[PDB]
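Extended Data, record Hepatitis A virus cellular receptor 1 homolog
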Amino acid sequence: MDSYVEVKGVVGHPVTLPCTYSTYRGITTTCWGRGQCPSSACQNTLIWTNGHRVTYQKSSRYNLKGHISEGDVSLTIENSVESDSGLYCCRVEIPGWFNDQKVTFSLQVKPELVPR
């Protein structure tokens, strides 16, 4: 099953990429990247967490507004544009060798109103 999460946002409003993981084994790091999830960490990194808070954000338009320490690492791109459409990668570094939780998103931001 080679498949990704489809996400749809409308220009001018914030679009969210839902990404979560269980902390049943304790807190952990996460990176966000533009482009598909590859092998080792994220490519075109947008975000990095230390486990409790964001420690790296490529731009202020990228924010994790959920309870990060609870397991909610969802990415929120403020004021989306057609420009944001593309693949996104959410990687959760879980225990084990070459074993990260990888989720690729396919985002589409279209205008909410196309004229008359």
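Summary. The CA atoms of residues 89 and 104 lie 5 Å apart.
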